[PDB]
UniProtKB/Swiss-Prot annotation, chain A:
Domain of life: Eukaryota
Quaternary structure annotation from Swiss-Prot or TrEMBL: Complex I is composed of 45 different subunits.
Protein family membership: Belongs to the complex I NDUFB5 subunit family.
Subcellular location: Mitochondrion inner membrane
Portion of the full sequence shown: 127 to 189 of 189
Protein name according to UniProt: NADH dehydrogenase [ubiquinone] 1 beta subcomplex subunit 5, mitochondrial
Function: Accessory subunit of the mitochondrial membrane respiratory chain NADH dehydrogenase (Complex I), that is believed not to be involved in catalysis. Complex I functions in the transfer of electrons from NADH to the respiratory chain. The immediate electron acceptor for the enzyme is believed to be ubiquinone.
Swiss-Prot record, chain B:
Name recorded for this polypeptide: NADH dehydrogenase [ubiquinone] 1 beta subcomplex subunit 10
The entry's keywords: Electron transport, Membrane, Mitochondrion, Mitochondrion inner membrane, Phosphoprotein, Respiratory chain, Transport
Taxonomic classification: Eukaryota, Metazoa, Chordata, Craniata, Vertebrata
Organism: Bos taurus
Predominant location: mitochondrion
Pfam families documented for this protein: NDUFB10
GO cellular component terms attached to this protein's record: mitochondrial inner membrane; mitochondrion; respiratory chain complex I
UniProt membrane topology term: Peripheral membrane protein
InterPro entries: NADH_UbQ_OxRdtase_su10 (IPR019377), NDUFB10 (IPR039993)
Length: 63, 170
């Protein structure tokens, strides 16, 4: 292989590996924020579904 | 065959023969024998080979590397720019090694050429060797086996800060 092909093939390799490296660092920060604040799709632990509530008038009024 | 400016030699001064003896010089007759028995057949073989070479003249070229931005102009961690700058710095480092090698060859040729008068007559070569080694030492010495343009720059900036301080204290 000529030097140019290896050289530009190297840059293509470096671009892929640098983009992957940045994403790995951004995922760690997103995970830290989502776990601490709970405002994201991850670490979203279930709560009781409000559709299980019965809103019909009851036997007694105060409720 | 080579650039006489890169690898200079002074003009040669050979004294003429001046015999003060009637005895024949054995070296003169051996020289004539060497010319007839060694040089001429050697020259005849070479001229045949060069005749074959002239029938097939083809060329090769010295590779030219465009200049690219230095490591000083690279944003931190920007590997695409750092890569090209790093490769350029490595090519320059090898070139500077051969520049020193050229100057050392000049010095050693002068020492042999000047004989018992080298200490005086090779001063200009000694001075040029002294300067290139100092410049080479400043650029590349003490970087370590894992050298890089980054480490090279860190050394220059340390040197520049020591020079700025010393000038201030003056």
């Amino acid at each position: 292989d000529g030097p140019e092909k290896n050289y530009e093939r190297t840059m293509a390799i470096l671009q892929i590996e640098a983009e992957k490296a940045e994403l790995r660092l951004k995922e760690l920060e997103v995970r830290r924020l989502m776990r601490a604040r709970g405002d994201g799709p991850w670490f979203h632990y279930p709560t009781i579904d409000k559709e299980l509530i019965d809103h019909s008038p009851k036997a007694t009024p105060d409720n | 065959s080579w650039d006489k400016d890169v690898y200079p030699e002074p003009p040669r001064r050979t004294p003429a023969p001046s015999p003060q003896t009637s005895l024949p010089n054995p070296i003169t007759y051996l020289t004539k024998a060497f010319d007839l028995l060694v040089d001429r057949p050697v020259t005849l073989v070479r001229e045949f080979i060069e005749r074959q070479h002239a029938k097939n003249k083809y060329y090769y070229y010295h590779r030219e590397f465009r200049r690219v931005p230095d490591i000083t102009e690279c944003q931190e961690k920007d590997v695409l720019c750092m890569f090209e700058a790093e490769m350029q710095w490595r090519r320059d480092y090898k070139v500077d090694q051969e520049i020193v090698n050229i100057i050392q060859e000049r010095l050693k040729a002068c020492q042999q050429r000047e004989g018992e008068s080298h200490r005086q007559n090779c001063a200009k070569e000694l001075e040029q060797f002294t300067q290139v080694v100092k410049a080479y030492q400043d650029r590349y010495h003490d970087l370590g086996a894992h050298y890089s343009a980054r480490k090279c720059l860190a050394k220059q900036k340390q040197r520049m800060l020591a020079e700025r301080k010393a000038a201030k204290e003056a």
